[model samples]
Target: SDPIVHFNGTHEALLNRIKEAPGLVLVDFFATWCGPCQRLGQILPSIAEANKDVTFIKVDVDKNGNAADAYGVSSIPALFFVKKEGNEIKTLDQFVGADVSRIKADIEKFK
Candidate 1:
């Protein structure tokens, strides 16, 4: 399995990643203390390995509140899709909670 990118820096760093990535960016909003979030972390690496074209990112809500708030994420285990084309970065889709099937389906849509 491949490694998941951890969004540990500033909000600008997150935006920079979104802007620089060539294709789909899967942003997982989580917290260190959340049980579901930890479970999702375990599940995501395999998905990340399977979808090599996609960028899998982990955002800790407790640590990166600004980034989480920017996306209107009020819950743990939130999934967001971002796509970059040239200089424009647009949010393709988003979902709340940890649904592996739905996450896989959404990823397949872009792939």
Candidate 2:
């Protein structure tokens, strides 16, 4: 319920937290103005409440353009799963414009 982890336009804080992670880092890439993006954003936060075992991060693609482009996000709602091993991140996969339920299920599997 405390939100395992969250990131906005700040990549420094996100990177710092990810460096200390003990579980899978599930990041939701969305823009405030995007229609489905806003919907997914609302759903993801609630799902984060239910699944406290993993680190859920919200990155506004519009703000974190570099990060989004680095990951090649062509859609509004892009879900990325990355496992942190020490200070490095090992990305599992990218799920674009996916429903909340499927994203939750898939990310949990990697965790």
Candidate 3:
């Protein structure tokens, strides 16, 4: 099965994904061409595998400008963990660097 879902949809599509799942939606706001984004190459897969309860996804900032703007992506490699309500996804937590330890803990707390 797939590890993390590499998101390739519009802003509305992305939001709908979270709304559909009231659990954790771990979104990595990234760019495929960006050098730093490669850091999560293996990291996210491992995390996604561990937390089967959570929904892991990747959003290319350059490709999906709408999602990037909504998520407040600035620097790079934003792993924003969004928790969902009835019709919204709230940013409950995140890890913005190349730190697997931090992500693991976040998953532990949430999932």
Candidate 4:
């Protein structure tokens, strides 16, 4: 199963991808220290594997603090769905937390 193995490298590049991508950007804010995230990571790709159109990415809050702060991420395993069209990106509050079914439903809605 294809998985979102967290973003690495340049911050500008990551932001550029999110801002420039023409589809859904689902970001998972997590830390290596977070047990919940570790558990979620095991199954996250299952959610992504079924939804091919959306851009599923994992961001380590410890490593990518700038991105986390920019998104106002307040907790580990915080999922942010940023829908992008052209140059405009809008935050869609369709899902959050550990509900796999809800998240799958949301993805199916967009797909």
Model-by-model lDDT, in order? 0.85, 0.73, 0.78, 0.73
Poorest lDDT segment (10 consecutive residues) of candidate 2: 4-13
Off by more than 4 A, model 1: none
Q: How close is each model in CA RMSD to the real structure?
A: 1.6, 2.5, 1.7, 2.3
- The residue ranges of model 4 lying beyond 4 angstroms of the native Cα positions read 1-5, 9-12, 94-96
Highest lDDT among the candidates is held by which one? Answer: 1
Clashes of each: 0, 0, 0, 0
Model with the higher TM-score, candidate 2 or 3: 3
Evaluated at residue 39, the lDDT of candidate 1 is 83
Instruction: Report the lDDT tens digits of candidate 4 across residue range 1-111.
Output: 454646864556566768855578787888877887888787888777866778888888887888777767786778877786666668775344666666667677766
Q: List candidate 3 stretches off by more than 4 Å.
A: none
Q: Would you list the rank order by TM-score, best first? A: 1, 3, 4, 2
Q: Relative to the unseen true structure, what is the C-alpha lDDT of residue 72 in candidate 4, on a scale of 0 to 100?
A: 73
Tens-digit lDDT string for candidate 2 (1-111): 368454644555666666666787787778888888878766776777777777887777777887677656778788778877667788887777857777867866765
Q: Could you tell me the C-alpha RMSD of candidate 1 in Å?
A: 1.6
Q: Would you list the clashing residue pairs of candidate 1?
A: none
* Candidate 2 pairs with clashing backbones: none
